[PDB]
Amino acid sequence: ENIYNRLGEDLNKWQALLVQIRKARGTFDNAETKKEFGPVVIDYGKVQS
């Protein structure tokens, strides 16, 4: 409801935020489960599903 009130009657209703939410899907929804970066590896395995 906070989101609804903040973006009450945007371009149509939001018409922008939903677009970046699709872009916000990055670093997520990918076959990769653990982000490697050199000797530091972070595994988003438990949180993935």
Binding site: R25, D29, N30, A31
Partner: peptide
């Protein structure tokens, strides 16, 4: 011989099924 092998060294072809944006 290759045909009956299909049914001669043969490479193993692989492909996967995945889902993205719930597709």
């Amino acid at each position: 011989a290759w045909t009956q092998v299909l049914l001669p060294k043969i490479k193993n072809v692989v492909h996967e099924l995945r889902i993205t944006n719930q597709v």
